[PDB]
Design a binder for this molecule. Sequence first.
Ligand SMILES: NC[C@@H]1O[C@H](O[C@H]2[C@@H](O)[C@H](O[C@@H]3[C@@H](O)[C@H](N)C[C@H](N)[C@H]3O[C@H]3O[C@H](CO)[C@@H](O)[C@H](O)[C@H]3N)O[C@@H]2CO)[C@H](N)[C@@H](O)[C@@H]1O
Ligand SMILES: NC[C@@H]1O[C@H](O[C@H]2[C@@H](O)[C@H](O[C@@H]3[C@@H](O)[C@H](N)C[C@H](N)[C@H]3O[C@H]3O[C@H](CO)[C@@H](O)[C@H](O)[C@H]3N)O[C@@H]2CO)[C@H](N)[C@@H](O)[C@@H]1O
Ligand SMILES: [Mg+2]
Ligand SMILES: [Mg+2]
Ligand SMILES: [Mg+2]
Ligand SMILES: [Mg+2]
Ligand SMILES: [Mg+2]
Ligand SMILES: [Mg+2]
Ligand SMILES: [Mg+2]
Ligand SMILES: [Mg+2]
Ligand SMILES: [Mg+2]
Ligand SMILES: [Mg+2]
Ligand SMILES: [Mg+2]
Ligand SMILES: [Mg+2]
Ligand SMILES: [Mg+2]
Ligand SMILES: [Mg+2]
Ligand SMILES: [Mg+2]
Ligand SMILES: [Mg+2]
Ligand SMILES: [Mg+2]
Ligand SMILES: [Mg+2]
Ligand SMILES: [Mg+2]
Ligand SMILES: [Mg+2]
Ligand SMILES: [Mg+2]
Ligand SMILES: [Mg+2]
Ligand SMILES: [Mg+2]
Ligand SMILES: [Mg+2]
Ligand SMILES: [Mg+2]
Ligand SMILES: [Mg+2]
Ligand SMILES: [Mg+2]
Ligand SMILES: [Mg+2]
Ligand SMILES: [Mg+2]
Ligand SMILES: [Mg+2]
Ligand SMILES: [Mg+2]
Ligand SMILES: [Mg+2]
Ligand SMILES: [Mg+2]
Ligand SMILES: [Mg+2]
Ligand SMILES: [Mg+2]
Ligand SMILES: [Mg+2]
Ligand SMILES: [Mg+2]
Ligand SMILES: [Mg+2]
Ligand SMILES: [Mg+2]
Lengths: 73, 101, 117, 88
Amino acid sequence: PSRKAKVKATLGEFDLRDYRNVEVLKRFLSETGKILPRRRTGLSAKEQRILAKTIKRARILGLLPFTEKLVRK
Amino acid sequence: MRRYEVNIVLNPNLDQSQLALEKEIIQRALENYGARVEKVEELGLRRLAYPIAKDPQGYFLWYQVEMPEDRVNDLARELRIRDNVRRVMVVKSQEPFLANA
Amino acid sequence: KRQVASGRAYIHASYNNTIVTITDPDGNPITWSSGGVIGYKGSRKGTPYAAQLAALDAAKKAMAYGMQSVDVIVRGTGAGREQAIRALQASGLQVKSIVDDTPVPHNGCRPKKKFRK
Amino acid sequence: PITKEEKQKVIQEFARFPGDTGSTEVQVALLTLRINRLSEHLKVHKKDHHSHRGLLMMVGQRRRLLRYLQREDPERYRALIEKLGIRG
RNA sequence: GUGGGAGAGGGUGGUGGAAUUCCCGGAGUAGCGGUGAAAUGCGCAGAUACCGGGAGGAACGCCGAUGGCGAAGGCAGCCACCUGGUCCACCCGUGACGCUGAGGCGCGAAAGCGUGGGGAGCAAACCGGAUUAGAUACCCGGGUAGUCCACGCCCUAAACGAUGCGCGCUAGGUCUCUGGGUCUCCUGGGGGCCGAAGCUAACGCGUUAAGCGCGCCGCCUGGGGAGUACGGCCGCAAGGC
Ligand SMILES: NC[C@@H]1O[C@H](O[C@H]2[C@@H](O)[C@H](O[C@@H]3[C@@H](O)[C@H](N)C[C@H](N)[C@H]3O[C@H]3O[C@H](CO)[C@@H](O)[C@H](O)[C@H]3N)O[C@@H]2CO)[C@H](N)[C@@H](O)[C@@H]1O
Ligand SMILES: NC[C@@H]1O[C@H](O[C@H]2[C@@H](O)[C@H](O[C@@H]3[C@@H](O)[C@H](N)C[C@H](N)[C@H]3O[C@H]3O[C@H](CO)[C@@H](O)[C@H](O)[C@H]3N)O[C@@H]2CO)[C@H](N)[C@@H](O)[C@@H]1O
Ligand SMILES: [Mg+2]
Ligand SMILES: [Mg+2]
Ligand SMILES: [Mg+2]
Ligand SMILES: [Mg+2]
Ligand SMILES: [Mg+2]
Ligand SMILES: [Mg+2]
Ligand SMILES: [Mg+2]
Ligand SMILES: [Mg+2]
Ligand SMILES: [Mg+2]
Ligand SMILES: [Mg+2]
Ligand SMILES: [Mg+2]
Ligand SMILES: [Mg+2]
Ligand SMILES: [Mg+2]
Ligand SMILES: [Mg+2]
Ligand SMILES: [Mg+2]
Ligand SMILES: [Mg+2]
Ligand SMILES: [Mg+2]
Ligand SMILES: [Mg+2]
Ligand SMILES: [Mg+2]
Ligand SMILES: [Mg+2]
Ligand SMILES: [Mg+2]
Ligand SMILES: [Mg+2]
Ligand SMILES: [Mg+2]
Ligand SMILES: [Mg+2]
Ligand SMILES: [Mg+2]
Ligand SMILES: [Mg+2]
Ligand SMILES: [Mg+2]
Ligand SMILES: [Mg+2]
Ligand SMILES: [Mg+2]
Ligand SMILES: [Mg+2]
Ligand SMILES: [Mg+2]
Ligand SMILES: [Mg+2]
Ligand SMILES: [Mg+2]
Ligand SMILES: [Mg+2]
Ligand SMILES: [Mg+2]
Ligand SMILES: [Mg+2]
Ligand SMILES: [Mg+2]
Ligand SMILES: [Mg+2]
Ligand SMILES: [Mg+2]
């Protein structure tokens, strides 16, 4: 599936290397804390690769979750 | 010398005098390790994803800086000495990278 | 003799059994039940039916404490996981919410041979 | 690492004329630079082999260029070696 | 040379969360566990299930790929320091300085050896429970060396693309990683699929040749005996060549 929308489309211009922008990055995580695949994020190889890094940085800083409890269900 | 970003996270519970105390400790530790401070952003209290030392929030600090490379780790070590100091990270600065520019 | 009346329901579901524990909102257990607490002995504890009876026994013992509504928390993937939830669904309890808390490693610990591959 | 001013300095030192970049002398100077810097790195980190292979290859190229120089113009060979303080 | 680029390439020091186990506390009770089914086992000295606090060892989920890097072995949380390779653009410098490489030397997964630490989980041997005609096994409960770190040995392998290295030449189509360009397209470097000519015993290969050529290295000469004997060399030993 993943045709609901792509993440890249919903956001405007923004800095991938910026690990401190929470509202931008949170859009790239699932219900859980997981980093979405490209078919979700709609990013490129290079892009996705930098995203992974900066998301992890944000995590260590405490701005982003490593994992999150699955609700509903 | 090279350009780094010093991210500091402190205890949300510090009063004013203790906060400025910690900040001055930071100024001094930076100067002594020879770090010239280019830009500073104090974000203060922010909610965190997970607790850090059982406290749900954290006090954020960002320092753009230029310092000798050899010293960096040492400085980092120094910064982590304080109890009030919760998290410390030091990043080589980078040109930004834009999607949908 | 507590009168909690609002609490958590932990469903721990393995392939070998199903354990319903019910606690106060701080997580401290009032009562619990399992497939083995129900009359079953052998493999049958890991049965959906066994899970149903476990859940209803637990829920009953809970309402005796005065329990009204629960927060369901499911750990483990096993048969009768969903049957446990569906059991509490109308137990005479309201189910306020369901969360899946099943623990996963970030890959730290080597599994038993049976689980490797 | 090696900053551009370090490079420029050793080039302007060993350049056969103004603007000489790739003559044998400058190539050997530069190789000697990276070599000695590497060897200093390998005093410590004695457990890093992947770099050590690099060192070997560098020595290879250098030895070959010095053999070439000794063949074509022995006087320049002696000059270069003396200046750099290698091979003996 | 200059200017740009991507990468789990390598070494050191820090560091982050999830999980397992163990310890303390709370709450709680009659089982937990495990299998085809059970049993051993654990549990009223209060386990299992739940919350909280703590300690430690190890491995890094999602990103993650038909992906990248490396000469190979191999390389995957994050950060900084150190460091090897490499590709593109400019067409600036040297002026054949090239290629290959017996021997030498260095590297070389796992297991194994020495010393000293470490030891959560897993686990050869082993101790039990099952199964079976028996079960020196598959299954279950335990569990030592080991797996981990440092230093030092060991030198093996389905160490595999079962395909030595370099260079030139011979249709294209398509997918992909990464440069540059006047960016629908052109142009490199890399990884894949189908396929011209051609090769091949066939399978298949096919600008990533197993095609057409040249240079150099290693190697083969029916099966068993046998990677054995002996000799030499290496090794602490196991043992290797
Ligand atoms: N992250 C540190 C790394 O440590 C490596 O090796 C180090 C680690 O193996 C180990 O560091 C400590 C150790 O002192 C202490 N006694 C126990 C602690 N658990 C270790 O830390 C490490 O343990 C293992 C690695 O074996 C990892 O799985 C774990 O994530 C990590 N925390 O001891 C070694 C010496 O410091 C390498 N030096 C290098 O990759 C890097 O510095
Ligand atoms: N491989 C290491 C990683 O390098 C990345 O960045 C690396 C590459 O992006 C960068 O490549 C540069 C290239 O830009 C520049 N134009 C030329 C330079 N020679 C290259 O560097 C390369 O060669 C040199 C030896 O000369 C090595 O020391 C170095 O490791 C290697 N990357 O060099 C960096 C250092 O290796 C990561 N950002 C860094 O965090 C990490 O250490
Ligand atoms: Mg059972
Ligand atoms: Mg060569
Ligand atoms: Mg790396
Ligand atoms: Mg833990
Ligand atoms: Mg207790
Ligand atoms: Mg007993
Ligand atoms: Mg706990
Ligand atoms: Mg290769
Ligand atoms: Mg750090
Ligand atoms: Mg000339
Ligand atoms: Mg050669
Ligand atoms: Mg020699
Ligand atoms: Mg080995
Ligand atoms: Mg080993
Ligand atoms: Mg020992
Ligand atoms: Mg075990
Ligand atoms: Mg066993
Ligand atoms: Mg047995
Ligand atoms: Mg039989
Ligand atoms: Mg028997
Ligand atoms: Mg040992
Ligand atoms: Mg060793
Ligand atoms: Mg293979
Ligand atoms: Mg191939
Ligand atoms: Mg290959
Ligand atoms: Mg472009
Ligand atoms: Mg490859
Ligand atoms: Mg044909
Ligand atoms: Mg085929
Ligand atoms: Mg083909
Ligand atoms: Mg191609
Ligand atoms: Mg052939
Ligand atoms: Mg032979
Ligand atoms: Mg042979
Ligand atoms: Mg014969
Ligand atoms: Mg014969
Ligand atoms: Mg043999
Ligand atoms: Mg012999
Ligand atoms: Mg001997």
